Design a protein around this ligand. Structure first.
Ligand code: QFS
Ligand code: CL
Length: 363
């Protein structure tokens, strides 16, 4: 019958439409993987000025959702024995020898517990090898490595950069030439080709100023991916079924499904952040709140790494000045969701859309 497709469209419309109006979002793409089949719902405008509509092939900036791609490359380096999570960071970059990175592990970098590396590189550090080198050489922890989580682009960005060094090639090259092709992603870019630029949505900020992300230190590792809802759902489907990939890449994906510690309701993996499922909307919003991004939290370390599978929701938010992304999946239900928008609108609102869709699918 037409009832299932009508019901899914009604459910997704009902979740999305009020949140778009309420947050003045110009364009938004949803992709859902349900019972092994993809479903796409596209809303509004990729560019207000030329009237280009959002489609499942429109490219959006996904911001820190990029960290899950970075984690997958590190997973590859790890499961290929080029590095280990307990290595000291300075083992992989001689410039860091003699610095405080002699006493910081790769796991600490990956999971934001190196001792207070900040949210962003300071404005004084430009996209320049020498400036980045000098920044890390001089940095000193605020508190003991392994004790407090402070969400940090320099932290996980260094993790990704060191993973690339361990493999003997630049990060960006490894992503384009190995990771994206291994995952079957042809609409996923760190540097959008000229021929694909017509697909790149405009981002919108205050007063609807146009905003596309500019160069920054370790931008590729931290926040550099542009992709379509269709490709990001393919990445979600790879996460739901790593066994469908060639074994080295299956192992790399599996490495991102391991939890190391908890903060509140959240279990931290490499890239992915996990919750028990079901959990309340308010709790999932709280785990994705501004204090979780901006404030340090003492960790509760697990006795051994924990498999992030079964009745769990794995997620990641991502933001740039002009864009707001959210991805969530439930391994034990073969369910995945992607929500990409061209405004940076509050995380709580992204989670509201997702939760309405997931709730509705449960009924
Ligand atoms: B990232 O998007 O995380 C925020 C949403 O959870 C992020 C992006 C940065 O620059 C664009 C810097 C830090 C984190
Ligand atoms: Cl940064």
């Amino acid at each position: 019958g037409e009832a299932p497709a009508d019901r899914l469209k009604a459910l997704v419309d009902a979740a999305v439409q009020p949140v778009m109006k309420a947050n003045d979002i110009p364009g938004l793409a949803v992709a859902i993987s349900l019972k092994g089949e993809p479903h796409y719902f596209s809303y509004g405008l990729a560019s207000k000025e030329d009237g280009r509509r959002v489609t499942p092939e429109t490219l959006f900036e996904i911001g820190s959702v990029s960290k899950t791609f970075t984690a997958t490359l590190a997973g590859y380096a790890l499961t290929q024995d080029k590095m280990r999570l307990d290595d000291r960071a300075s083992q992989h970059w001689p410039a860091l020898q003699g610095s405080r990175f002699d006493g910081i592990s790769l796991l600490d970098l990956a999971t934001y517990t190196a001792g207070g590396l900040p949210l962003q590189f300071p404005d004084s550090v430009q996209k320049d090898q020498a400036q980045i080198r000098d920044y890390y050489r001089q940095w000193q922890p605020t508190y003991a490595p392994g004790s407090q989580r402070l969400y940090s682009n320099p932290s996980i960005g260094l993790f990704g950069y060191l993973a690339a060094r361990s493999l003997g090639q630049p990060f960006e090259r490894l992503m384009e030439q190995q990771v994206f092709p291994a995952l079957g992603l042809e609409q996923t870019h760190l540097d959008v080709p000229e021929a694909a630029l017509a697909q790149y949505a405009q981002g919108y900020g205050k007063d609807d100023r146009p905003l596309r992300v500019g160069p920054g230190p370790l931008d590729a590792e931290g926040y550099g991916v542009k992709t379509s809802a269709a490709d990001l759902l393919r990445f979600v489907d790879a996460n739901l079924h790593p066994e469908r990939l060639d074994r080295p890449w299956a192992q790399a994906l599996d490495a991102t499904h391991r939890g190391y510690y908890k903060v509140g309701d959240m279990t931290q993996g490499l890239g992915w952040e996990a919750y028990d499922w079901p959990i309340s909307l308010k709790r999932l919003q709280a785990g994705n709140s501004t204090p979780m991004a901006l404030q340090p939290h003492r960790i509760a370390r697990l006795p051994a790494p924990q498999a992030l599978e079964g009745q769990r929701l794995l997620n990641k938010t991502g933001s740039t000045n002009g864009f707001g992304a959210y991805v969530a999946f439930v391994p034990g239900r073969d369910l995945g969701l992607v929500i990409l928008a061209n405004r940076n609108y509050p995380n709580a609102e992204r989670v509201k859309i997702a939760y309405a869709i997931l709730s509705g699918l449960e009924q």
